Amino acid sequence: NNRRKIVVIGASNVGSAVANKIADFQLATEVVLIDLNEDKAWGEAKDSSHATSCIYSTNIKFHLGDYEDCKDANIIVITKLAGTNAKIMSSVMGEIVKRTAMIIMITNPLDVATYVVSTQFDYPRNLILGTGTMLETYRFRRILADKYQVDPKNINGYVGEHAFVAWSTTGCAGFPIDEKLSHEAVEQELVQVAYDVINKKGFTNTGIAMAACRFIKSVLYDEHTILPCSAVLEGEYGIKDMVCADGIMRSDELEKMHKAAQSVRSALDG
Amino acid sequence: NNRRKIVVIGASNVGSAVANKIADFQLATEVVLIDLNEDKAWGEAKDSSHATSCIYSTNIKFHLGDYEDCKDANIIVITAGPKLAGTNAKIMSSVMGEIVKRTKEAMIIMITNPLDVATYVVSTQFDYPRNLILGTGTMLETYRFRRILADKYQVDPKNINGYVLGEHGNAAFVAWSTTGCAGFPIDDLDEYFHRTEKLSHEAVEQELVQVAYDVINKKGFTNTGIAMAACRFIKSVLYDEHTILPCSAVLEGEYGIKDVALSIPRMVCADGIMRSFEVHLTDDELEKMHKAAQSVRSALDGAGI
Amino acid sequence: MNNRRKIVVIGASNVGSAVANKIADFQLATEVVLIDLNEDKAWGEAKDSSHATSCIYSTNIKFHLGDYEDCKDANIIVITAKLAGTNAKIMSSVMGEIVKRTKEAMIIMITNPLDVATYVVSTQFDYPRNLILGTGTMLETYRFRRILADKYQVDPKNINGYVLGEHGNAAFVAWSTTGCAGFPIDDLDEYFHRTEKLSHEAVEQELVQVAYDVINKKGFTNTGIAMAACRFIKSVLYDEHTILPCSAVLEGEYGIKDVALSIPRMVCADGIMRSFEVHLTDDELEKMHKAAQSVRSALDGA
Amino acid sequence: MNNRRKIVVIGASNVGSAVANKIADFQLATEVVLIDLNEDKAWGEAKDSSHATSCIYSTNIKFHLGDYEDCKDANIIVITALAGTNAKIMSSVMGEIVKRTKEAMIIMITNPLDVATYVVSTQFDYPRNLILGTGTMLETYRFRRILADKYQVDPKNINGYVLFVAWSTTGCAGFPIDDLDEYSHEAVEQELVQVAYDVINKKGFTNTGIAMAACRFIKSVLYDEHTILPCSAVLEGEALSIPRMVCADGIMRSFEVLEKMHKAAQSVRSALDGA
Ligand SMILES: [Cl-]
């Protein structure tokens, strides 16, 4: 089969940002939008189908669909608060398993939703992946970029729950990051921006969409990239309970990691 | 200067779409978001800056700026939208009044609706070079016309040649005389695929009007398709492609219509609209063109001007 | 299913490395293998491209020297390997190994003579006819788009139509299917007010002179043909269902049979779904038949 | 202002054509000019490229043969044209560039890279910031690929700038590169030099890797990314490749950030004295 179909469950802000970016980057032959409001998914797909009709965009098949479209889907994107999200995962995941494929997790809480779909159903663990702290990484690379006027791509390292930057693994242009900069100030600037965008913009659809496209490009091109993604831990860094075409392959600072593990654990119990 | 700055007025659905499509396609070194709701413009800009930080996206400068950024801007995409003609006419008069007072060499890409009215307001009320003013116009309808026949016959929409001319709101008519699918008449597809259901030219035009009203209601807005059309015109001016595309602008006697903004084939180059291409319309198509000219002017006069 | 896309490029010469590089630049496949008799050239061309794919802006596209066993899990197999009979022997030997390892890949012919090589790999083997394609006059179409573009400073993309016939010789412009920016190309002289009206026979000769000039001035033609190959790769990988001019064995189109020529054909994910026999005028029909006389003459000479 | 970007490619040989074609594939310019003494081959390369840009998915990039007068409004001027004879070529082509322009970013690819970059940045009064040399940028692509093919990991993960592999500033996705052996340093360095010549003896030259390297620098200046990448240029303190910030205005500042570095400076200096 010379076709690549990526399904996007949930056709809201983030949902339309992920599908539109998939069409802009041309990462799929057919894009299906699933959502309770079929009118929203159809309109978003129909409007996207017009964009794909441009002279520079490939003829990507955008159209409304159902869970049946997950059968031939190369990737399936899923777009007190923890329990409600888990209930949604039980419905979409219950249908995906009934029909089949890599599953990219976006719906929030991310760490919780990714855990629900990775333990409550009989799906290959490698095919389950959540954006995780990939967004915080993008933000971390942007904070230091605007601080010293340097390409964000220079900023290296990862950023826990989608919430701590591992300064030991970070480095710009090959050397450590370091008036004077404050390691706690950068962390404070991260949590504030995470609250300012949602408060001033109303949602975060562009960053999440780009982070999702990165994982899509990794799974589609089998790059074997080591990126901060969500995955049920199995003793990694004393905590328990590589992005490729076949899913996931292998994997003071330690205190913050365990602190986040205790935060998600409390959410898992609730 | 090795930089290309694109300012985008309006940070709403249509304004954030054209901004993110400009970043996905990498059509600007610095993208500036301007909107009365500065909080929305900053949030969309900051969120976009996080996307550009990806490993595959160039370091595009996304930030909340003021009209001062339009001073050295290469393109100014105005999308700040809302009787409908009068309200938008006042909005276009405010945004344009601030642009002329800072720059007069940037490219103006009209997207706000009514498209024909907005393009006519900023083009005749101010002393901005007319060539540097362009409107998406019925280019979005062209995409819809290409998609309608594409799904109807399972053919690449890009093979569907021609234009959809007229008004971008309701008076958008397809000029069947200038159309053609893959080097042969569009009406022949029924004979090629052996379809007993004859291709009704009227049905296709009506279907183009229903889909336009379905998306605006079902989806609640139209920001995806329109964002791509703006990128096409942005690519035409950034690459000096001299592409003859259907964009909206004040007519200067084409088809006998003057003092009215409509969508007709016009060459888009680095300097904007180079010239117009008066393609011979049929007696029925030309009648639709004049009908569309009276529709926009009936709305322009109703709002004053 | 398979989330990977694998393209096979037989022959790692100028054109061979032009298609693999262009593919890598556009990112069309997950793994691209170069199969050439000169394994050193294929390894060198692949390795050099492997360094490019390692860029921060380029995906991790797998570049490596492979053999015909790689064609088993391949979605597309681009072939860039008296001249008509000699190449026919290369196609029979090359295609002889492709049919043994796979029967579902897309065969995109680029080797010259294009029409001869396309007919050899399409009739002398049991490969699915729909999965056999050749660039054909798609390259000549680009030249036609650029000639009218540079002559009137109009976007070549606006130049609609086709160049049909045999690739490299007997190629004619299908004026009955052409037209710039929705209007006839002949109307450009009236729009731009050109005293020296457009001579159709002048651009046809220029279409053949430009081909000989590049080969004599540049030494070869690998850039334009590489883009045409990527266009067809995009048509099959994105299931675009595009009606483009590609070479393939005719089965009654224009009364021409037993020869491969470039005519309007719809390219889908499964290759050529069907052909579109446009209404060629009396003069163009003779050019379509004259091209068949040259192709059949080459096949008979083999 | 100017809404179009113009790039000039001096020398249309393998590397030159690879750079111009990739600039067209990535659409990093509105007009590409191929200047070369062999006007025939530059015209054909540009004419052949003009056909590729006539595609549906390719912007209308103006490809044509030009002269040094095109460098007047050229945004970037790449130079893809033992060490002495090449210095005469760099001095002749540069003397014509400075004679008509003074604001175009200059990228150097001619060999010797370190010598050719120093020849154009010393015998003329051109802004130093607007000079640049690919240098070891391609060597880094090799170091990333060798480690990528050695452990089947993304080459992008591999970090650090080869300048010799400057192991003191390298890393794989943020963790020690040696950890992959658990899931040497002098051996990959030998592979880093033997592979470069194996491609030259097997393929005949190296134009694909170096072409994207230039494009990597083209994207850095056309987008004002301020990316700190290893590029060859005039070395003051700390021509040779070192970590430098690349932006639209050229090289803004340098990043200092050892035995092999001094040996390379002595070799480049010895070649400059002989020229
Ligand atoms: Cl096409």
Tab-separated table of C-alpha atoms in Angstrom, chain A residues 13 16-17 20-21 23-25 37-40 42-44 46-62 135 137-139 141-143 145-146 149-153 193-194 196-197 199-208 210-211 213-214 217-218 221 223 225, chain B residues 13 16 20-21 23-26 37-44 46-62 139-140 142-144 146-148 150-151 155-158 207 211 214-215 217-226 228-229 231-232 235-236 241 243:
chain	number	residue	atom	x	y	z
A	13	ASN	CA	-8.767	23.714	18.171
A	16	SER	CA	-7.696	21.154	13.528
A	17	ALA	CA	-4.176	22.411	14.258
A	20	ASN	CA	-3.911	21.314	9.147
A	21	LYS	CA	-0.218	20.940	10.002
A	23	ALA	CA	-1.609	18.842	5.405
A	24	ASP	CA	0.842	21.763	5.383
A	25	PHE	CA	3.790	19.427	5.922
A	37	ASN	CA	-20.013	16.959	16.558
A	38	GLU	CA	-19.849	15.403	13.098
A	39	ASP	CA	-20.691	18.835	11.677
A	40	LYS	CA	-17.441	20.211	13.113
A	42	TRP	CA	-17.000	17.555	8.303
A	43	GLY	CA	-16.658	21.332	8.087
A	44	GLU	CA	-13.034	21.215	9.221
A	46	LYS	CA	-14.258	20.071	3.967
A	47	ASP	CA	-12.511	23.397	4.603
A	48	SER	CA	-9.174	21.583	4.752
A	49	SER	CA	-10.007	19.732	1.534
A	50	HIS	CA	-10.203	23.135	-0.179
A	51	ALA	CA	-6.756	24.089	1.119
A	52	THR	CA	-5.297	20.830	-0.205
A	53	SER	CA	-6.691	21.786	-3.639
A	54	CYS	CA	-4.013	24.484	-3.928
A	55	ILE	CA	-1.262	24.268	-6.550
A	56	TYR	CA	1.404	23.676	-3.888
A	57	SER	CA	-0.464	21.181	-1.672
A	58	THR	CA	-0.853	17.516	-2.567
A	59	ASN	CA	-4.345	16.072	-3.037
A	60	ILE	CA	-4.747	15.006	0.592
A	61	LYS	CA	-8.136	13.319	1.090
A	62	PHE	CA	-9.895	15.280	3.841
A	135	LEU	CA	5.719	21.025	24.434
A	137	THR	CA	10.823	21.379	25.626
A	138	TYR	CA	9.698	23.656	22.777
A	139	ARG	CA	8.937	26.339	25.371
A	141	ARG	CA	14.137	26.128	23.822
A	142	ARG	CA	12.170	29.320	23.123
A	143	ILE	CA	12.781	30.909	26.538
A	145	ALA	CA	16.311	31.647	22.590
A	146	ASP	CA	14.617	34.980	23.335
A	149	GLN	CA	19.035	35.799	20.803
A	150	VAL	CA	19.996	32.254	19.808
A	151	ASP	CA	18.301	29.706	17.565
A	152	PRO	CA	15.930	27.617	19.759
A	153	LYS	CA	17.240	24.493	17.993
A	193	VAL	CA	3.974	31.200	29.905
A	194	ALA	CA	2.074	27.915	30.194
A	196	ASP	CA	-0.409	33.094	30.110
A	197	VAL	CA	-1.032	31.491	26.705
A	199	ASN	CA	-5.324	32.554	29.754
A	200	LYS	CA	-4.717	35.135	27.007
A	201	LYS	CA	-5.087	32.918	23.922
A	202	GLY	CA	-7.796	30.641	25.344
A	203	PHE	CA	-6.028	27.450	24.234
A	204	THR	CA	-2.738	26.022	22.952
A	205	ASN	CA	-3.185	24.468	19.502
A	206	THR	CA	-0.087	25.480	17.500
A	207	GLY	CA	2.608	24.189	19.854
A	208	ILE	CA	0.806	20.909	20.535
A	210	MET	CA	3.913	21.034	15.939
A	211	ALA	CA	5.066	18.706	18.721
A	213	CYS	CA	4.000	16.528	13.838
A	214	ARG	CA	7.523	15.916	15.154
A	217	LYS	CA	7.640	12.663	11.206
A	218	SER	CA	9.690	10.385	13.479
A	221	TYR	CA	10.468	8.292	8.582
A	223	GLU	CA	14.235	8.180	12.479
A	225	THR	CA	14.788	9.804	17.551
B	13	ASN	CA	-9.688	32.276	13.608
B	16	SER	CA	-4.132	32.848	13.347
B	20	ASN	CA	0.526	29.417	11.260
B	21	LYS	CA	0.368	28.449	7.586
B	23	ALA	CA	5.141	29.476	9.632
B	24	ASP	CA	4.511	25.917	8.420
B	25	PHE	CA	5.481	26.891	4.867
B	26	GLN	CA	8.220	29.224	6.200
B	37	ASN	CA	-7.499	42.006	21.678
B	38	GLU	CA	-3.763	42.229	22.297
B	39	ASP	CA	-4.068	39.332	24.749
B	40	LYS	CA	-5.272	37.043	21.950
B	41	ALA	CA	-2.558	38.311	19.600
B	42	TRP	CA	0.159	37.704	22.197
B	43	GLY	CA	-1.124	34.250	23.136
B	44	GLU	CA	-1.269	33.104	19.515
B	46	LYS	CA	3.761	33.020	21.944
B	47	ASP	CA	2.201	29.640	21.157
B	48	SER	CA	3.464	29.992	17.592
B	49	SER	CA	6.966	30.817	18.839
B	50	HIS	CA	6.898	27.465	20.650
B	51	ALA	CA	6.048	25.696	17.381
B	52	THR	CA	8.846	27.447	15.476
B	53	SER	CA	11.240	26.149	18.153
B	54	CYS	CA	10.734	22.656	16.713
B	55	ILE	CA	13.670	20.963	15.027
B	56	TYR	CA	12.005	21.086	11.597
B	57	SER	CA	10.709	24.677	11.784
B	58	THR	CA	12.912	27.697	11.158
B	59	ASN	CA	13.431	30.194	13.968
B	60	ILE	CA	10.594	32.472	12.873
B	61	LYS	CA	10.117	35.479	15.166
B	62	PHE	CA	6.546	35.388	16.487
B	139	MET	CA	-9.498	32.337	-4.997
B	140	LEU	CA	-11.079	30.393	-2.141
B	142	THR	CA	-11.626	28.330	-6.982
B	143	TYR	CA	-10.240	25.877	-4.427
B	144	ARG	CA	-13.826	24.811	-3.704
B	146	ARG	CA	-11.469	22.369	-7.884
B	147	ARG	CA	-12.420	20.178	-4.922
B	148	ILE	CA	-16.033	19.725	-6.064
B	150	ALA	CA	-12.078	16.481	-7.883
B	151	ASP	CA	-14.303	14.397	-5.602
B	155	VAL	CA	-9.360	13.593	-10.305
B	156	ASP	CA	-6.564	15.717	-8.886
B	157	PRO	CA	-8.138	19.114	-8.052
B	158	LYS	CA	-5.054	20.874	-9.442
B	207	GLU	CA	-23.265	23.190	-4.721
B	211	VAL	CA	-20.756	24.131	0.832
B	214	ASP	CA	-22.433	24.614	5.366
B	215	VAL	CA	-18.838	25.069	6.541
B	217	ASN	CA	-22.307	27.018	10.015
B	218	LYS	CA	-21.183	23.429	10.657
B	219	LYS	CA	-17.563	24.329	11.430
B	220	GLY	CA	-18.595	27.782	12.680
B	221	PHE	CA	-15.924	29.587	10.643
B	222	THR	CA	-13.749	29.396	7.516
B	223	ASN	CA	-10.063	29.834	8.368
B	224	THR	CA	-8.337	26.767	6.877
B	225	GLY	CA	-9.114	27.158	3.179
B	226	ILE	CA	-8.759	30.948	3.227
B	228	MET	CA	-3.990	28.595	2.088
B	229	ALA	CA	-5.166	31.071	-0.551
B	231	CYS	CA	-0.138	31.758	1.316
B	232	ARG	CA	-0.456	31.253	-2.456
B	235	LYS	CA	4.312	32.917	-2.483
B	236	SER	CA	3.489	34.786	-5.704
B	241	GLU	CA	6.085	34.239	-9.947
B	243	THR	CA	0.987	34.195	-11.575
